[PDB]
Structure 1
Amino acid sequence: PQFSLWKRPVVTAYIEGQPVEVLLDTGADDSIVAGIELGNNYSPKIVGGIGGFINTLEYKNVEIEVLNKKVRATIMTGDTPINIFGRNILTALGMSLNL
């Protein structure tokens, strides 16, 4: 699939059985999903963007299915207005930006 940028490129993902809507963001190093339950093997981290810095919960190799394709990749939880899917998953899926 092609992606028009006329609308926000929001697609729906299943984060390990848990369905969730995420934004394909090529200006994110990482992926931040709010309120999903991923467990116990976490490490707190802080992320940054334009208003400042947020505190997160880093989980590794979680399983993810999006655009009907599979992946295991780092997942950071936090207080984000939207679930962002950054470059770490975009590469995993083989996504690109074309002019």
Structure 2
Amino acid sequence: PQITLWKRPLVTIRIGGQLKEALLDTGADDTVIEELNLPGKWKPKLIGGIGGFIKVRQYDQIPVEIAGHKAIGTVLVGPTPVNIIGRNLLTQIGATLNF
């Protein structure tokens, strides 16, 4: 689809069998989801944002369906204020910015 930016670009995703809402974030390297369980193993990681750094769980090779488009890649889980889909998955679904 084509998404304008007057509102936050929030979409529904499928992850782990569950539906969630997430923000399409071109300013994020990685995909960061609110605290939850995901199948499989993980390892601790730290990531940073506007306010500093947080601890997350790094899960690899997780399938995520993003507005109907499939991706399989790293998902970080931790105390983010909002679920964000970052460039590691945006690239998989063919997303570009256009102006």
When normalised by structure 2's length, the TM-score is 0.95
Equivalent residue letter for 1:62: I
Do structure 1's residue 38 and structure 2's residue 38 form an aligned pair? yes
**Is the Cα contact below 8 Å between 2:65 and 2:71 reproduced in 1?**
yes
TM-superposed CA distance for 1:65, in Å, is 0.9
Equivalent residue letter for 2:39: G
Q: Please, which runs of 5 or more residues in structure 2 have no aligned partner?
A: none
TM-superposed CA distance for 1:56, in Å, is 0.5
RMSD after superposition: 0.9
Q: 2:84 aligns to what?
A: 84
TM-superposed CA distance for 1:40, in Å, is 4.2
Matches of 2:78 and 2:86 in 1, distance apart?
14
TM-superposed CA distance for 1:18, in Å, is 1.2
When normalised by structure 1's length, the TM-score is 0.95
Q: 2:49 aligns to what?
A: 49
Matches of 1:4 and 1:10 in 2, distance apart?
11
Equivalent residue letter for 1:37: N
* CA deviation vs aligned residue, 1:26-79 (integer Å, no higher than 9, x gap): 000001101331134100000001111000000000111112121211000000
Segments of 4+ moved more than 4 angstroms: none
Identical aligned residues as a percent: 48
